[PDB]
């Protein structure tokens, strides 16, 4: 629960899987433009330890901070795959969906 | 953000630390004194005016131990300053003595003993301080028993001291504010506090040492 890594929980998009057991994840935060007072995305890349090499490019993942950094740039681990690329399960209904259409009707299992 | 490594700052640091251990100034060099001018030649600093008389007329601890067979191991050594100040017997029971071989007369070095101050004996032996002072005296064997013969005085002392005016008023006011009604006056407990004399031997293990720069 006590870790030296500043970012404890961050969600991001997996953008690279060329390193062994390391997923390169793009994390975007909304930052206020002081002059325009409009929020613009600012993106930062995080290396996440993926022991099982289950991450595919384009999937949304949840990263948990490691207690201490395991490498120079590897400070996080893959806690969860929130949305698998092209294989999303609707969290509200629990059914497989393809974009905005249900692949299996929510009424099948009542 | 990548700091450019400074490698000469670490090299010199190690070299300095080493030279301070190899070219260290020995006890003979540091604590030598010129009795004609009463100045330490190594540092070239004059001794205090109040210390001049004692330096001329007194001997160092190991100056007395230099003439003893085993450097006065297990021999009681008092100090003139203690004899003058305190009536109660104050002495170090020597346990270990490491003499300086570089000294021609073996008159410098370090000593460890058990301190008995004002008739109170410490439980454990610790390093003796001010070993280089010209203040020590050797207790003769025939006189050792009589010198150490002391009767414990009554320890009765004041345990409670009145709070200072403003503090007391605030404490009492707080009682009444919280609803406590007590006629007793708040009193500090000084029994835990023990005021040692200013000349009580301090710890020689945490004391520093003069550096190597010779004059």
């Amino acid at each position: 629960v006590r870790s030296s890594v500043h970012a404890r929980w961050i969600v991001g998009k997996v953008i690279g899987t060329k390193m062994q057991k390391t997923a390169k994840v793009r994390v975007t935060r909304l930052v206020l433009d002081p002059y325009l007072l409009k929020y613009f995305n600012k993106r930062k890349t995080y290396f996440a330890h993926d022991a099982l090499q289950q991450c595919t490019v384009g999937d949304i993942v949840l990263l948990r901070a490691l207690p201490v950094p395991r490498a120079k740039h590897v400070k996080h681990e893959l806690a969860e795959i929130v949305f698998k690329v092209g294989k999303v399960i609707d969290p509200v209904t629990g059914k497989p969906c393809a974009g905005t259409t249900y692949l299996e009707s929510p009424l099948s299992s009542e | 953000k990548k700091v450019r490594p400074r490698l000469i700052a670490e090299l010199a640091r190690r070299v300095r630390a080493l030279r301070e251990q190899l070219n260290r100034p020995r006890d003979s060099q540091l604590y030598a004194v010129d009795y004609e001018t009463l100045t330490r030649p190594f540092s070239g600093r004059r001794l205090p005016v109040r210390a001049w008389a004692d330096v001329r007329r007194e001997s160092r601890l190991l100056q007395l131990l230099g003439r003893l067979p085993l450097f006065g191991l297990g021999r009681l050594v008092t100090r003139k300053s203690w004899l003058w100040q305190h009536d109660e017997p104050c002495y170090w029971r020597l346990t270990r003595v490491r003499p300086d071989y570089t000294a021609q007369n073996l008159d410098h070095g370090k000593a460890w003993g058990i301190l008995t101050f004002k008739g109170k004996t410490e439980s454990e032996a610790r390093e003796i301080e001010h070993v280089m002072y010209h203040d020590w005296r050797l207790v003769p064997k025939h006189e050792e028993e009589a010198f150490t013969a002391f009767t414990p005085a009554p320890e009765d002392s004041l345990a409670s001291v009145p709070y200072p005016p403003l503090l007391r008023a605030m404490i009492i006011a707080e009682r009444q504010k919280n609803g406590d009604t007590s006629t007793e006056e708040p009193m500090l407990n000084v029994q835990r506090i023990r005021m040692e004399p200013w000349d009580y031997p301090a710890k020689q293990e945490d004391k520093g040492r003069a550096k190597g720069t010779p004059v």
Binding site: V92, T93, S105, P106, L107 | -
Partner: protein, 51 residues
């Protein structure tokens, strides 16, 4: 306590979804029944022309 209330709110909303989805299928089935009828006539009419 608030997490249990949130989960209860999500379950209530799920029941309303199931009701809404059931009605939409009924309407879907009807529209799909009429499209199939129209399509079948078009295919038959076109098949006759090619024959």
């Amino acid at each position: 306590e608030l997490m249990a209330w949130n989960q209860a709110e999500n379950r209530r909303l799920h029941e309303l979804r199931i009701a809404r989805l059931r009605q939409e299928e009924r309407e879907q089935e009807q529209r799909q029944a009429l499209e199939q009828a129209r399509k079948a006539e078009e295919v038959q009419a076109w098949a006759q022309r090619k024959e």
